[PDB]
RNA sequence: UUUGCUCCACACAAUAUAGAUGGAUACGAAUAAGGCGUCCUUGUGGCGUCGCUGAACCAUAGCAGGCUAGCAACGGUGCACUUGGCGGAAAGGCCUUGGGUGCUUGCUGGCGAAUUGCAAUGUCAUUUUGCGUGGGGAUAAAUCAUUUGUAUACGACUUAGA
């Protein structure tokens, strides 16, 4: 017989996923997509995440309720020490990646 | 004939020219099968496709990943097709099976070496004349297959250079044709065509 | 059924008392041998008249050949075949060069437009028209055009060998 | 039934030259020159003289014959765009609310706005296809026109202009507003 | 500027097309195609190179491209006359198809020392061969 | 001469066999160069070996053969039948085979 | 942990072979169209020719391919150096310059072969490993134990320690 009740799952599948990583430092799958008309730029930056503090700013949202208004917001403090490059590394196309 | 053969894939059909490489494997002639992305299927491409989503539904209820795995690209497409031809669970199936090299595209070492076609599977002997048929590149990209552009990059820069190469064989036949030419109507030319050379 | 023969079958009524010689009915009969002709004789003349294989003789059993072998005909035929759910008349039109010729491909057409096996097809009549404008059918009309000529375009060529090194050429 | 030979034949005029190799055509003339890849089809192309060329089928059933004809259309549309141009006027119909059409360019895109239909604050935008040009026509109430080279495109750009103001869920045997095409001729009058 | 248009200069079958027999008992014979029967089925006849007259599918010919002047449905002596007349045999031996048909005939018909001996010419026409093919 | 060959290769296909039965005694040769069974009736009756190689020298020498002779045609496409003194051992489908022509009634 | 490791060359033992036994001989595109040659007005051009299968093309003679002599041409080809260039799709291969050394069946000679006895695959390939030899070359880390908790049932992980 069916569930009598429809509730939706629990979880999600494409997370599905749960094991421990491969190290404490996660891999970027998917840098942002190359305009060659700007000047050269990192994508991404390393740093670590001290933790937690709080902000007070006013608000620019027009027909908003706290428009121009204070509000706090929680913010996280990453300690980004100025990265270094010690190396460069070039990817061909291929037709298997 | 030859100790390995590589067979150009393009405008051939995937049923026939898998049927005659699983023979081949099996009766152990070593293959190689390139361009794959431009394979052909009879039957317009929307029932391929079609074809391809019945394929791809077809999954192991309790866990997908020990499931019928759904290759897209057209080398693996057409290995399926093959593998399917060929007793793939024996010592001997596996022993053909290692006899074939599939690829997209004509890399390294087989871009230098003579390709071949097979008569009972190209499409243009085999099937009428305005039967709609089906590119393997464009219905690979079609269910996920994700390097249908580098391909053609790389097959571009492929035919610029065997076209130059070809113009060099070209104009060095065209020398050969002329010093052939004066080799005529002497004694052993006469006597050749005589013994029928 | 096979490459047909054209057999006349000549038979009659077995002579009694009261009937001593007897008409004596012929039909030409196309079939495979002349086992087959003389079943298919009796298949006939049993629908015509109160005889059977018991109650009759056959008297002569010859070969037609046709008269000019070589000269292209156009043949008028007039079927009764059984379909599925009934029975028809047809007229069908065949050109081909003999009499044997056209009901070797009058099975095959009956056999592949209409689904009518060798059981189900009885030959009425197999005429040969005379004269162009008496051929009813167009897809005979086709070919007594003056000055006929059409291509066969797209040849393909049967390979004796399993690869072929240069390409296929599929000119003409 | 595998008809033996049927042909149909295409008119050449005096300012076009048509050219076909495989099967591609080429017909060139006093308003530009207009390409078509017809290599779907097999047919077989003759030029008999540069006033009239035949095209046939060699053993073709009901549906090779049938697209014979449509091979002859085809190649005489191109023809009658080089010589005479193709021209579809438009007429807006509205009860209430008028119609704002105009031409707006986003990095050279050319583009038809459609703005004000039936009240609505969506703004339509109908890119326009290379060939084919606009001309909101004067002391004609309510009317575009677009005249071009190629009836597919030109066709195809009041089809578009037609269908983006399809109507605002509602009773559109009522709600008669829209785009439609009141008229398909050609750019040279007289003819 | 003209209307060039390309293609389609195929071989018709037609009365007084020759064609070449490429399987049945005849098999390499010239024959002319007399009258048609059909779109697959045509009469050949071929009393020169001595076929029998006969009705034959357009899967065991191949149309060759010399055509003659025939009559609709000639029979095999007016057939003998006209092939007779236009010459079609020698013009057929001209061709250099007829000429590969005889070239791998006459190599298949190699005995073994012939086989050295085009070995040997062979080799005597190469030298001569790369000689002048350093020169120019 | 670089060429020293004085048979004619070929391939062991496979053991006679139904379709779930097969019969090790007879094997199918498949020559090469053969398209017929009437191009393939010069070879019956030419006699087969397989040649093999192990890492044990048994006496003088590292290879060993197994002989066998042509029986009869098989099929429309000159496959050729084989029976042999010891039977060929199914590893070897698809191995190479030379017959030879020894026995050439030439 | 008694001179270990790596590359090269030859020196010999083993090891096995999914199966050498002249050569996988490189345009692309179309197929109701093309390949090649040639010419101009360089084109969706004119003219000629070819297909109709690789049954081709190249190579192929010599003690499993010996030893010598000569004639003619200045070619072909193996090997090792060398000059430069191209090739990153899995390039690891292709093209080129120069001289050297070897062979030449392009042509003409002289000598040798047997007896494996009338056949026996009558042994000629590459695949990996090991060992002494001789010539270059370079002189580490990881794990346990200790430690931290960004981790943790245990392993694992993340750190730290001359």
């Given at each position: 017989?069916?569930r009598k009740?429809?509730?939706p799952?629990?979880?999600?599948?494409?997370?599905?996923?749960?094991?421990?990583?491969?190290?404490?430092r996660?891999?970027v799958?998917?840098?942002?997509?190359?305009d060659?008309?700007?000047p050269?730029?990192?994508?991404?930056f390393?740093?670590?995440?001290?933790?937690?503090?709080?902000?007070v700013?006013?608000?620019?949202?027009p027909?908003?309720?706290?428009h121009?208004?204070?509000?706090?917001?929680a913010?996280?403090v990453?300690?980004?020490?100025?990265?270094?490059?010690?190396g460069v590394?070039?990817?061909v196309?291929?037709?298997?990646? | 004939?030859?100790?390995?053969?590589?067979?150009?894939?393009?405008?051939?059909?995937?049923?026939?020219?898998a049927?005659?490489?699983?023979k081949?494997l099996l009766?152990?002639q070593?293959?190689?099968?390139?361009?794959a992305?431009?394979?052909?299927?009879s039957?317009?491409?929307?029932?391929n496709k079609?074809?391809?989503?019945?394929?791809?539904?077809?999954?192991t209820?309790?866990?997908k990943?020990?499931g019928?795995?759904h290759?897209?690209?057209?080398?693996?497409?057409?290995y399926?097709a093959?593998?399917?031809?060929?007793?793939h669970?024996?010592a001997?199936?596996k022993?053909?099976?290692?006899?074939?090299?599939?690829?997209?595209?004509?890399?390294?070492?087989?871009?230098k070496?003579?390709?071949?076609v097979?008569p009972?599977?190209?499409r243009?002997?085999?099937?009428?004349?305005?039967?709609?048929?089906?590119?393997l590149?464009?219905?690979?990209?079609?269910?996920?297959?994700?390097?249908?552009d580098?391909?053609?990059?790389?097959?571009?820069?492929?035919?610029?250079?065997?076209?130059?190469?070809?113009?060099?064989?070209?104009?060095?036949?065209?020398?050969?044709?002329?010093?052939?030419?004066?080799?005529?109507?002497?004694?052993?030319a006469?006597?050749l065509?005589?013994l029928?050379? | 059924?096979?490459?047909?023969?054209?057999?006349?079958?000549?038979?009659?009524?077995?002579?009694?008392?009261?009937?001593?010689?007897?008409?004596?009915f012929?039909?030409?009969?196309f079939?495979s041998?002349?086992?087959?002709?003389?079943?298919?004789?009796?298949?006939?003349?049993?629908?015509?008249?109160?005889?059977?294989?018991?109650?009759?003789?056959?008297?002569?059993?010859?070969?037609?050949?046709?008269?000019?072998?070589?000269?292209?005909?156009?043949?008028?035929?007039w079927?009764?075949?059984?379909?599925r759910?009934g029975?028809h008349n047809?007229?069908k039109?065949?050109?081909?060069?003999?009499?044997?010729?056209?009901?070797?491909?009058?099975?095959?057409?009956?056999?592949?437009?209409?689904?009518?096996?060798?059981?189900?097809?009885?030959?009425?009549?197999?005429?040969?028209?005379?004269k162009?404008?008496?051929?009813?059918?167009?897809?005979?009309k086709?070919?007594?055009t003056?000055?006929?000529?059409?291509?066969?375009?797209?040849?393909?060529?049967?390979?004796?060998?399993?690869?072929s090194?240069?390409?296929?050429?599929?000119?003409? | 039934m595998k008809?033996?030979?049927?042909?149909?034949?295409?008119?050449v005029?005096?300012?076009v030259?048509?050219?076909?190799?495989?099967?591609?055509?080429?017909?060139?003339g006093?308003?530009?020159?207009?390409?078509?890849?017809?290599?779907?089809?097999?047919?077989?192309?003759?030029?008999?003289?540069?006033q009239?060329?035949?095209?046939?089928?060699?053993?073709?059933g009901?549906?090779?014959?049938?697209?014979?004809?449509?091979?002859k259309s085809?190649?005489?549309?191109?023809?009658?765009?080089?010589?005479?141009?193709?021209?579809?006027?438009?007429?807006?119909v509205?009860?209430?609310?008028?119609?704002?059409?105009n031409?707006?360019?986003?990095?050279?895109?050319?583009?038809?706005?459609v703005?004000?239909?039936?009240?609505?604050?969506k703004?339509?935008?109908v890119?326009?296809?290379?060939?084919?040009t606009?001309?909101?026509?004067?002391?004609?109430?309510?009317?575009?026109?677009?005249?071009?080279?190629?009836?597919?495109?030109?066709?195809?750009?009041?089809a578009?202009?037609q269908?983006?103001?399809?109507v605002?869920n509602?009773?559109i045997?009522?709600?008669?507003?829209?785009?439609?095409?009141?008229?398909?001729?050609?750019?040279?009058?007289?003819? | 500027?003209?209307?060039?248009?390309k293609?389609s200069?195929?071989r018709?079958?037609?009365?007084g097309?020759?064609?070449?027999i490429?399987?049945g008992?005849?098999?390499g014979?010239?024959?002319a195609?007399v009258?048609?029967?059909?779109?697959?089925?045509?009469?050949i006849?071929?009393?020169?190179?001595?076929?029998?007259?006969?009705?034959?599918?357009?899967?065991?010919?191949?149309?060759?491209?010399?055509?003659f002047?025939?009559?609709r449905?000639?029979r095999?002596?007016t057939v003998?006359?006209?092939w007779?007349?236009?010459?079609?045999?020698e013009?057929?031996?001209?061709?250099?198809?007829?000429?590969?048909?005889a070239?791998?005939?006459?190599?298949?018909?190699?005995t073994?020392?012939?086989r050295f001996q085009?070995?040997?010419?062979?080799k005597?026409?190469?030298?001569?061969?790369?000689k002048?093919?350093?020169?120019? | 001469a670089?060429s020293?060959?004085?048979?004619?290769?070929?391939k062991?296909?496979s053991?006679?066999?139904?379709?779930r039965?097969?019969?090790?005694?007879?094997?199918?040769?498949?020559?090469?160069?053969?398209?017929?069974?009437?191009?393939?009736?010069?070879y019956l009756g030419?006699?087969?070996?397989?040649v093999?190689?192990?890492?044990?020298?048994?006496?003088?020498?590292?290879?060993r053969?197994?002989?066998?002779?042509?029986?009869?045609?098989?099929?429309?496409?000159?496959?050729?039948?084989?029976?042999f003194?010891?039977?060929?051992?199914?590893?070897?489908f698809?191995?190479s085979?030379?017959?030879?022509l020894?026995?050439?009634?030439?």
């Amino acid at each position: 017989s069916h569930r009598k009740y429809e509730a939706p799952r629990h979880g999600h599948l494409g997370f599905l996923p749960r094991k421990r990583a491969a190290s404490i430092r996660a891999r970027v799958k998917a840098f942002p997509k190359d305009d060659r008309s700007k000047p050269v730029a990192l994508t991404s930056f390393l740093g670590y995440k001290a933790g937690m503090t709080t902000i007070v700013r006013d608000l620019d949202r027009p027909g908003s309720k706290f428009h121009k208004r204070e509000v706090v917001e929680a913010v996280t403090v990453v300690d980004t020490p100025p990265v270094v490059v010690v190396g460069v590394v070039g990817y061909v196309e291929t037709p298997r990646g | 004939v030859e100790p390995v053969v590589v067979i150009d894939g393009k405008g051939h059909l995937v049923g026939r020219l898998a049927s005659v490489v699983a023979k081949q494997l099996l009766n152990g002639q070593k293959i190689v099968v390139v361009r794959a992305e431009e394979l052909n299927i009879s039957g317009e491409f929307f029932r391929n496709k079609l074809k391809y989503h019945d394929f791809l539904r077809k999954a192991t209820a309790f866990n997908k990943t020990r499931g019928p795995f759904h290759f897209r690209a057209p080398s693996r497409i057409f290995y399926k097709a093959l593998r399917g031809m060929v007793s793939h669970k024996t010592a001997r199936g596996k022993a053909a099976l290692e006899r074939l090299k599939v690829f997209e595209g004509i890399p390294p070492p087989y871009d230098k070496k003579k390709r071949v076609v097979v008569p009972q599977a190209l499409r243009v002997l085999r099937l009428k004349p305005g039967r709609k048929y089906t590119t393997l590149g464009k219905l690979s990209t079609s269910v996920g297959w994700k390097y249908e552009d580098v391909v053609a990059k790389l097959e571009a820069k492929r035919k610029v250079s065997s076209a130059e190469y070809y113009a060099k064989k070209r104009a060095f036949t065209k020398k050969v044709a002329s010093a052939n030419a004066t080799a005529a109507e002497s004694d052993v030319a006469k006597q050749l065509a005589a013994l029928g050379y | 059924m096979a490459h047909f023969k054209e057999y006349q079958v000549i038979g009659r009524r077995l002579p009694t008392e009261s009937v001593p010689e007897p008409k004596l009915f012929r039909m030409r009969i196309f079939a495979s041998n002349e086992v087959i002709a003389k079943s298919r004789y009796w298949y006939f003349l049993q629908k015509l008249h109160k005889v059977k294989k018991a109650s009759g003789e056959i008297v002569s059993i010859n070969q037609i050949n046709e008269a000019h072998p070589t000269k292209v005909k156009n043949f008028g035929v007039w079927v009764r075949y059984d379909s599925r759910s009934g029975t028809h008349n047809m007229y069908k039109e065949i050109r081909d060069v003999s009499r044997v010729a056209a009901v070797e491909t009058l099975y095959q057409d009956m056999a592949a437009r209409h689904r009518a096996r060798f059981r189900s097809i009885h030959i009425l009549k197999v005429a040969e028209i005379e004269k162009t404008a008496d051929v009813k059918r167009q897809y005979v009309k086709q070919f007594l055009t003056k000055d006929l000529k059409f291509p066969l375009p797209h040849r393909v060529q049967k390979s004796t060998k399993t690869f072929s090194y240069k390409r296929p050429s599929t000119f003409y | 039934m595998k008809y033996i030979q049927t042909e149909q034949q295409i008119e050449v005029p005096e300012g076009v030259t048509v050219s076909i190799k495989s099967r591609i055509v080429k017909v060139v003339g006093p308003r530009g020159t207009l390409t078509k890849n017809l290599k779907h089809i097999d047919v077989t192309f003759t030029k008999v003289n540069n006033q009239l060329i035949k095209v046939a089928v060699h053993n073709g059933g009901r549906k090779h014959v049938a697209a014979l004809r449509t091979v002859k259309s085809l190649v005489d549309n191109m023809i009658t765009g080089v010589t005479k141009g193709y021209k579809y006027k438009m007429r807006y119909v509205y009860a209430h609310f008028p119609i704002n059409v105009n031409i707006v360019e986003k990095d050279g895109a050319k583009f038809i706005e459609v703005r004000n239909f039936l009240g609505d604050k969506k703004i339509r935008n109908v890119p326009v296809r290379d060939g084919v040009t606009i001309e909101f026509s004067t002391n004609v109430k309510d009317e575009i026109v677009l005249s071009g080279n190629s009836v597919e495109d030109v066709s195809q750009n009041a089809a578009d202009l037609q269908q983006i103001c399809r109507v605002r869920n509602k009773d559109i045997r009522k709600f008669l507003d829209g785009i439609y095409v009141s008229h398909k001729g050609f750019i040279t009058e007289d003819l | 500027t003209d209307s060039i248009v390309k293609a389609s200069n195929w071989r018709l079958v037609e009365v007084g097309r020759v064609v070449l027999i490429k399987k049945g008992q005849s098999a390499g014979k010239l024959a002319a195609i007399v009258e048609i029967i059909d779109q697959k089925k045509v009469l050949i006849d071929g009393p020169k190179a001595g076929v029998p007259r006969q009705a034959i599918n357009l899967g065991q010919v191949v149309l060759t491209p010399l055509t003659f002047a025939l009559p609709r449905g000639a029979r095999t002596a007016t057939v003998s006359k006209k092939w007779a007349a236009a010459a079609v045999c020698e013009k057929w031996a001209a061709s250099s198809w007829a000429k590969k048909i005889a070239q791998r005939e006459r190599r298949a018909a190699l005995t073994d020392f012939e086989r050295f001996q085009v070995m040997v010419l062979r080799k005597q026409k190469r030298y001569t061969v790369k000689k002048a093919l350093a020169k120019a | 001469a670089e060429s020293h060959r004085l048979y004619v290769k070929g391939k062991h296909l496979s053991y006679q066999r139904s379709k779930r039965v097969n019969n090790p005694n007879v094997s199918l040769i498949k020559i090469e160069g053969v398209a017929t069974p009437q191009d393939a009736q010069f070879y019956l009756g030419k006699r087969i070996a397989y040649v093999y190689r192990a890492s044990k020298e048994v006496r003088g020498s590292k290879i060993r053969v197994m002989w066998g002779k042509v029986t009869r045609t098989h099929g429309n496409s000159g496959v050729v039948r084989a029976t042999f003194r010891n039977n060929l051992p199914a590893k070897t489908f698809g191995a190479s085979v030379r017959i030879f022509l020894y026995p050439s009634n030439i």
